[PDB]
Amino acid sequence: MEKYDIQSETQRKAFDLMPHFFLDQEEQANFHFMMHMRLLLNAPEFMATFERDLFEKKLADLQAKCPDLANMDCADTFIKMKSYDFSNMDRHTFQHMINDASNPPIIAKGFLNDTKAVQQWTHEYLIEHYKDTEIIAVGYKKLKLEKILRSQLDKDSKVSYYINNSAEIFNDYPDLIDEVGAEKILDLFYGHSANSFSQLFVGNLRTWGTNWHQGNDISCALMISGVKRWYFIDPRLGYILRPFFDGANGMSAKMDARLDMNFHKIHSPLYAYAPKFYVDLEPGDVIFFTKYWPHAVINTTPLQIMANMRMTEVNLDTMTKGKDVPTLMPVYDNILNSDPSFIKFKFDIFNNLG
Amino acid sequence: SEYLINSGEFNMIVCPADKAYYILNDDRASTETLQEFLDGEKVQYHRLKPLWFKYRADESWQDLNKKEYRLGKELSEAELIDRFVLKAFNFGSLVAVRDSQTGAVKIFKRDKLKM
Numbered sequence: 001m002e003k004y005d006i007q008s009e010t011q012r013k014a015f016d017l018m019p020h021f022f023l024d025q026e027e028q029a030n031f032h033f034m035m036h037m038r039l040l041l042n043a044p045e046f047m048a049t050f051e052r053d054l055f056e057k058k059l060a061d062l063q064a065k066c067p068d069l070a071n072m073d074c075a076d077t078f079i080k081m082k083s084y085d086f087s088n089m090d091r092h093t094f095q096h097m098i099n100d101a102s103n104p105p106i107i108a109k110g111f112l113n114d115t116k117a118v119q120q121w122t123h124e125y126l127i128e129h130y131k132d133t134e135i136i137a138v139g140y141k142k143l144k145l146e147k148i149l150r151s152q153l154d155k156d157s158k159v160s161y162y163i164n165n166s167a168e169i170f171n172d173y174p175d176l177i178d179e180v181g182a183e184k185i186l187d188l189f190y191g192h193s194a195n196s197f198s199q200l201f202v203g204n205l206r207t208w209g210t211n212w213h214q215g216n217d218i219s220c221a222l223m224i225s226g227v228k229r230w231y232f233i234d235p236r237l238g239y240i241l242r243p244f245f246d247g248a249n250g251m252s253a254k255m256d257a258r259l260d261m262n263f264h265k266i267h268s269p270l271y272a273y274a275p276k277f278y279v280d281l282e283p284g285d286v287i288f289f290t291k292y293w294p295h296a297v298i299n300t301t302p303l304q305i306m307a308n309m310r311m312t313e314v315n316l317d318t319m320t321k322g323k324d325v326p327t328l329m330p331v332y333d334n335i336l337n338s339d340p341s342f343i344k345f346k347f348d349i350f351n352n353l354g
Numbered sequence: 355s356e357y358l359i360n361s362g363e364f365n366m367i368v369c370p371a372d373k374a375y376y377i378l379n380d381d382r383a384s385t386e387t388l389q390e391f392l393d394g395e396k397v398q399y400h401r402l403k404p405l406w407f408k409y410r411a412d413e414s415w416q417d418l419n420k421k422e423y424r425l426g427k428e429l430s431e432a433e434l435i436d437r438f439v440l441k442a443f444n445f446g447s448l449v450a451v452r453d454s455q456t457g458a459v460k461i462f463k464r465d466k467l468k469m
């Protein structure tokens with residue numbers, strides 16, 4: 001409870017409900033079997049009947065624990081996340097917090113406040129000063145950042161640009177590292193993880209954000225301009241989102257974060273009553289979160305600028321892949337480590353570090 | 355063959371031939387059955403509760419290409435269970451395998467034996 005900022009009776013009741021969502025060993029065995037096959041068979045709704053039966057049984061478990069569950073306000077089931085001051089943060093203390101599976105996503109409040117990016121970077125500023133910058137993107141190889149920024153500033157524009165998060169912008173443009181303050185992130189992770197992927201995200205409100213999904217690596221979101229509202233659920237409640245795979249690196253879910261909570265109450269009651277954690281990521285704020293933390297992102301300002309850094313576990317001594325970080329969903333390690341595509345992908349990352 | 359499969363914070367013994375799997379915990383019944391499994395002695399599965407996976411005999415699904423599959427037609431039930439136990443398909447979970455006839459045991463993950 002002390003790891004979150006609860007502000008109502010309904011929020012507190014939702015939080016106290018969380019342990020009753022956790023799957024028993026037989027339910028875990030069937031969830032493992034289902035999710036393993038959903039990847040291997042490339043079948044998003046494999047064992048949909050079991051999943052449906054599980055949701056019904058799990059709702060009955062909540063109703064047994066909370067007889068007047070129907071009365072609690074599903075609109076007020078969002079719990080504000082606590083943020084930290086990283087002024088006196090050392091890499092050793094940080095790496096312990098990252099390795100602690102009981103810790104929720106870590107938000108460093110105003111960590112990048114004194115960076116050039118946070119101080120100066122806007123859609124307007126980037127257009128005139130960064131005319132040569134190219135990013136991996138396409139309309140829904142590489143395109144000029146200026147071209148994307150201009151199109152996003154044009155109200156009459158037709159084409160929206162999808163920016164690929166599997167890029168290396170800091171490899172392409174090493175000067176940007178100190179500008180966005182990425183060296184602070186590298187310092188915190190030195191001897192723990194190496195930066196596998198880096199990308200700069202620029203958007204208007206024609207892209208509303210990202211729907212429920214989860215990552216298979218450590219992610220760092222560097223908020224530069226505008227505000228994004230992040231939703232999270234505990235990894236052990238991931239199953240309520242109806243998770244599936246679009247390949248090993250496409251860990252998706254069918255839960256629509258946009259929908260009214262009273263609409264969810266009818267169709268997805270587990271999600272409706274579940275405690276959902278949220279943070280408003282403001283310029284200078286950095287959020288760190290480990291593997292299998294489901295999240296949705298909703299753009300709340302007309303324009304946003306955000307840098308993303310994906311980190312992979314390394315051993316400096318050996319140079320090779322580091323031991324897999326402790327997690328609340330170790331079953332996903334077993335599933336992904338069975339996929340030869342994912343195994344090769346992880347080795348290709350390490351070949352690309354050298 | 356019989357397979358010791360890891361599902362994160364617990365191991366289970368899967369017996370495809372019998373359509374039975376047994377969840378192992380830190381108790382006498384589990385440790386004694388696990389000892390028999392590893393040591394190549396007759397395994398007393400009677401002292402554990404047998405479960406089976408909650409896929410329907412008539413499981414039907416679509417792949418991402420929208421191609422339609424039905425269990426017992428495009429994929430056999432035997433082939434589906436292979437994809438959870440065999441070294442080729444679920445090596446991330448496979449702790450050990452036991453030959454049913456000879457009672458010969460191959461241990462892959464020694465670190466996962468004691469949970």
Ligand SMILES: [Fe+3]
Nearest residue numbers: 210214215295
């Ligand atoms: Fe994400």
